[PDB]
Amino acid sequence: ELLELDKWA
Amino acid sequence: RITLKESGPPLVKPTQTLTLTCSFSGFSLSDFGVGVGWIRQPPGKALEWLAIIYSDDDKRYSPSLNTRLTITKDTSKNQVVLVMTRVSPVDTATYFCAHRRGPTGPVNAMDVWGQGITVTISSTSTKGPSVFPLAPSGTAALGCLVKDYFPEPVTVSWNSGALTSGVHTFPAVLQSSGLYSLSSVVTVPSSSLGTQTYTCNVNHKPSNTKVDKRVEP
């Protein structure tokens, strides 16, 4: 999406 | 071990604001990477992700609910808080807070959940139910319509408990009016219709309202 990555990715 | 518990108001009015607290123990929002999230579940629906907050005050919300939610943490009280503004009846759900492990694989999951808290959005005030008959006419059915009460719950028994077989007390529905409506039916032998008597015993404690409604053809 320009999807955000999770804190631990 | 780790245990969490949600608290706040089980009843909230449309538009008003909902404030929930997650009190935990067995861990601290001070352990690097630890997270505490909020997940809600509408009655009969699937889990919905709400927001997450970690040890650094790192925050994330549901894009769809983003301007309505505010999540914080008090490390002194070991509590996390969720504020949801201008709630409507579609917010009625069970809210869960959960624990997320930090870098030691195992951060990929919410490992410990609270038991959740049921919040209901109604512009309604306590009210007793009106009890109507569902008249019958091989197997026959009859019952009681326990209409317009608030809030949950209500108890129903047949023939003062002496009748339990064939009974089906259904889950109440939240009508668009803000009031509940539930149904209770018992299935019997047509031949018993004229000699046996069927009476439902309704009890809405919240309004101190008791009704015994006899039901026939």
Added chain:
Amino acid sequence: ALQLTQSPSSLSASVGDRITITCRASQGVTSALAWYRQKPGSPPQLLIYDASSLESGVPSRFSGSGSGTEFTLTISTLRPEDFATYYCQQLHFYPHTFGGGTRVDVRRTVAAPSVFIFPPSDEQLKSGTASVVCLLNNFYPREAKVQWKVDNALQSGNSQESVTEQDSKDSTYSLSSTLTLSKADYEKHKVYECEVTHQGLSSPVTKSFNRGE
């Protein structure tokens, strides 16, 4: 956002059965996928984390595999306590989506419901409203369809229904549907019909009554 599709959405089994369940991600979420079992009245319980790892304390019968977009949960021999709803959650992208869930219930032979229609009471008519309810008693599987009809007009947006839990002894379900009308509207019409569609019924059953007859 990232959609997680669970399959099947509902499934019936018997104890000792071997079942596998899936969760598809519209985008690769690496191994960042978790599986939860949720029994009624109880909160979600972690079974599998990081897509393939068994959570400590969880029975060995549960297993999980997958990566990228395809993931499965398998129960080698399902137990009585495994009749619940299962969910998958991905924690790779924000927000952390959950799937729609797979409901696992107890298989029993197909039983068609006994249908009953209940006209409203005269005492309620005074309140100014008319509630007519329809009863679907002891059927299986769970899917049933209720269609309300007043003078053959199909009703929409004016009925509410609730289903009971699967019975402990006979594994059936029971449904209740309520059609709510204003006293005036009820008195303006004649035939009240409750049409029920369900697997055990070759053709749809209709239970009706004429208001003053």
